Ligand binder design. Sequence first.
Ligand SMILES: CCCCCCCCCCCCCCCCCC(=O)OC[C@H](COP(=O)([O-])OCC(O)COP(=O)([O-])OC[C@@H](COC(=O)CCCCCCCCCCCCCCCCC)OC(=O)CCCCCCCCCCCCCCCCC)OC(=O)CCCCCCCCCCCCCCCCC
Ligand SMILES: CCCCCCCCCCCCCCCCCC(=O)OC[C@H](COP(=O)([O-])OCC(O)COP(=O)([O-])OC[C@@H](COC(=O)CCCCCCCCCCCCCCCCC)OC(=O)CCCCCCCCCCCCCCCCC)OC(=O)CCCCCCCCCCCCCCCCC
Lengths: 74, 54
Amino acid sequence: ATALYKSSALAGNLFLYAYNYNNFTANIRLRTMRYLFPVVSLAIFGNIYWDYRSQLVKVNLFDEYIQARAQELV
Amino acid sequence: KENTGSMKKPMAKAYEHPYNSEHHPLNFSAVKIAETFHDFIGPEQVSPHYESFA
Ligand SMILES: CCCCCCCCCCCCCCCCCC(=O)OC[C@H](COP(=O)([O-])OCC(O)COP(=O)([O-])OC[C@@H](COC(=O)CCCCCCCCCCCCCCCCC)OC(=O)CCCCCCCCCCCCCCCCC)OC(=O)CCCCCCCCCCCCCCCCC
Ligand SMILES: CCCCCCCCCCCCCCCCCC(=O)OC[C@H](COP(=O)([O-])OCC(O)COP(=O)([O-])OC[C@@H](COC(=O)CCCCCCCCCCCCCCCCC)OC(=O)CCCCCCCCCCCCCCCCC)OC(=O)CCCCCCCCCCCCCCCCC
C-alpha cells in the first residue's frame, strides 16, 4: 500500500509536469525544475524500489529459514 | 478614379508560437490566476428572492 501510494504520488508529479509542459520547457524562469525534476524523480523512484526490494529480500530469507530449521527439528 | 482601386494580397499568417496557448499561457501574471480563480468559486450567486435566506 505504501509503495503503491508513493508510486501514485510520483505519477502525480509526472502529470503536473505534463499538464504544464510548455511552461517548464520554454520559460527559462523554470529551467531549474526542467533540469532537476528528473534527478528528484529518480531519487524518489530509488527510495520506493529500494524499500520494496529490501523488504522482498528479507521476506524470502525469513521463509527459507523457517522451512529449513523446521525440518532439522523434526 | 478612386472606384477603380484594388487591394493587394496580404500575408497568410504570422508566426504561431508552439508553446503559448490561451489556456496554458507561457508567461505568468495575476490576470490569468484571476480567471482560474473566478472559474473555481464560480460567478456571483444571484438570488431571485425578496428576502435573504438566513
Ligand atoms: C467527493 C467525492 C470524492 C471522490 C474523490 C475523487 C475526486 C475527483 C478526483 C479528480 C482528480 C483526478 C482526475 C481523475 C480523472 C477524472 C476525469 C477528468 O479529468 O475530468 C474530466 C476531464 C475534463 O475536465 P472538465 O471538468 O470537464 O473541464 C476542464 C476544463 O475544460 C479545463 O481543461 P483542463 O484540461 O485544463 O482541466 C484539467 C482537469 C482534468 O485533467 C486531466 O486531464 C485528467 C487526468 C488526470 C490524471 C491524474 C494523474 C494520473 C497519471 C496517469 C496514471 C496512469 C496509470 C496507468 C498507466 C497505464 C499505461 C502504462 O483537472 C485536472 O487536471 C485534475 C487533476 C487532479 C489533481 C492531480 C494532482 C496529482 C498530484 C497529487 C498526487 C496525490 C496522490 C494521488 C495521485 C493519483 C494519481 C494516480 O476530462 C478530460 O480531461 C479528458 C482528457 C482526455 C485526454 C486524456 C489523455 C490522458 C492524459 C493522461 C496524462 C498523462 C500524464 C503523464 C503520464 C503519467 C503516468 C506516468
Ligand atoms: C446526521 C444529521 C447531520 C446533518 C444534518 C443536516 C444539517 C446540515 C446543515 C446545513 C444547514 C443548511 C445550510 C445552508 C447554508 C449554510 C448556512 C448559512 O447560514 O448560509 C447562509 C449564510 C448567509 O445567508 P444569505 O441570506 O443567503 O446571505 C445573504 C448575504 O449574501 C450575506 O451577507 P450580508 O452581509 O450581505 O447579509 C447579512 C449576513 C450577515 O452575517 C454574515 O454575513 C456572517 C459573516 C460571516 C463572514 C465574516 C468573515 C468570516 C468568514 C471567513 C471565512 C472563514 C472560513 C473559511 C476559511 C477556512 C477554510 C475552510 O448574513 C446574515 O444575515 C447573518 C448570518 C447568518 C446567521 C449566523 C450564522 C452563523 C454561522 C454561519 C457560518 C458557519 C461558521 C462555522 C460553524 C461551523 C463549525 C464547524 O451564508 C453565510 O453567511 C456563510 C455560510 C457558511 C456556512 C458554513 C457552515 C454550513 C453548516 C450550516 C449548519 C448551521 C450552522 C452551524 C454553526 C452553529 C454555530 C452557532
